[PDB]
């Protein structure tokens, strides 16, 4: 099945998923020179104070905290979103060392992780039928460099322990996501897909500018987890990111001058 490694990494995924070279794949490298100011955008709207975590699970690509979304919680709106759309879970992508680890790159740099909070919009009904729509998805993407701990991401790594295999999962409730948002939330948008097959073309890519700062000790303990399921050998849960992808006819729009 698809994974990370030289055998059924992202160079492979095409054969299975022909998308993988579709006109709309992410990520992409944002060239801040190139992105235009956009004053059409609004500023996002990112309403998490309901927000009901679930549960964590490791999924044998990465560690997915997920959201009661049968209702109006978290939501995400405006920026060059049409509608409201629904927060379902979050995860990460992060590196072997602190230099790689982020799908989207800046001026061509990687930073040691990102983070996605993925949203799907309510006027499709539920994920499994917004996934098949254009503007089914909204994936908010934020950096993380390593640097100062941040406070509200130790709930999540005093739980990895609990999560080290493939398919473990533990209790994951009353986490607030809010504590995951740097100060600002100045944005680049582009259209663009999943980032893990299916690799579906359903998504508005809003990735912030300002990354969060996390410390080497949290970002060691991501590297820790493994992607194979217990009493198997064990294969550590690093380089979890797909490299940029050719921006074909997209422009990449700033929120900000
Ligand atoms: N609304 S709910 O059932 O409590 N929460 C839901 N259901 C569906 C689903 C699938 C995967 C991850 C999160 C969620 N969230
Ligand atoms: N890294 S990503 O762009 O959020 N890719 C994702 N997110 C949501 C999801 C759920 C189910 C299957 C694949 C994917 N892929
Ligand atoms: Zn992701």
């Given at each position: 099945?698809?994974?990370?490694?030289?055998?059924?990494?992202?160079?492979?995924?095409?054969?299975?998923?022909?998308?993988?070279?579709?006109?709309?794949?992410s990520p992409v490298d944002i060239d801040?020179?190139?992105?235009?100011?956009?004053?059409?955008?609004?500023?996002?709207?990112?309403?998490?104070?309901?927000?009901?975590?679930?549960?964590?699970?490791?999924?044998?690509?990465?560690?997915?905290?997920?959201?009661?979304?049968?209702?109006?919680?978290?939501?995400?709106?405006?920026?060059?979103?049409?509608?409201?759309?629904?927060?379902?879970?979050?995860?990460?992508?992060?590196?072997?060392?602190?230099?790689?680890?982020?799908?989207?790159?800046?001026?061509?740099?990687?930073?040691?992780?990102?983070?996605?909070?993925?949203?799907?919009?309510?006027?499709?009904?539920?994920?499994?039928?917004?996934?098949?729509?254009?503007?089914?998805?909204?994936?908010?993407?934020?950096?993380?460099?390593?640097?100062?701990?941040?406070?509200?991401?130790?709930?999540?790594?005093?739980?990895?322990?609990?999560?080290?295999?493939?398919?473990?999962?533990?209790?994951?409730?009353?986490?607030?996501?809010?504590?995951?948002?740097?100060?600002?939330?100045?944005?680049?948008?582009?259209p663009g897909s999943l980032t893990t097959p299916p690799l579906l073309e359903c998504?508005?890519?809003?990735?912030?500018?300002?990354?969060?700062?996390?410390?080497?000790?949290?970002?060691?303990?991501?590297?820790?987890?493994?992607?194979?399921?217990?009493?198997?050998?064990?294969?550590?849960?690093?380089?979890?990111?797909?490299?940029?992808?050719?921006?074909?006819?997209?422009?990449?729009?700033?929120?900000?001058?």
């Amino acid at each position: 099945h698809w994974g990370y490694g030289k055998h059924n990494g992202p160079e492979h995924w095409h054969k299975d998923f022909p998308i993988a070279k579709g006109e709309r794949q992410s990520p992409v490298d944002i060239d801040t020179h190139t992105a235009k100011y956009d004053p059409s955008l609004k500023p996002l709207s990112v309403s998490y104070d309901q927000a009901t975590s679930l549960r964590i699970l490791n999924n044998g690509h990465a560690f997915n905290v997920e959201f009661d979304d049968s209702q109006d919680k978290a939501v995400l709106k405006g920026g060059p979103l049409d509608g409201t759309y629904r927060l379902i879970q979050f995860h990460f992508h992060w590196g072997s060392l602190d230099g790689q680890g982020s799908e989207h790159t800046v001026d061509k740099k990687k930073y040691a992780a990102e983070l996605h909070l993925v949203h799907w919009n309510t006027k499709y009904g539920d994920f499994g039928k917004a996934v098949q729509q254009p503007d089914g998805l909204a994936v908010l993407g934020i950096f993380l460099k390593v640097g100062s701990a941040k406070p509200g991401l130790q709930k999540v790594v005093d739980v990895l322990d609990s999560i080290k295999t493939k398919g473990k999962s533990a209790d994951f409730t009353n986490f607030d996501p809010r504590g995951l948002l740097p100060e600002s939330l100045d944005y680049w948008t582009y259209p663009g897909s999943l980032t893990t097959p299916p690799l579906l073309e359903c998504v508005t890519w809003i990735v912030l500018k300002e990354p969060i700062s996390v410390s080497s000790e949290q970002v060691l303990k991501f590297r820790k987890l493994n992607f194979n399921g217990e009493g198997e050998p064990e294969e550590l849960m690093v380089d979890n990111w797909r490299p940029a992808q050719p921006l074909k006819n997209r422009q990449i729009k700033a929120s900000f001058k």
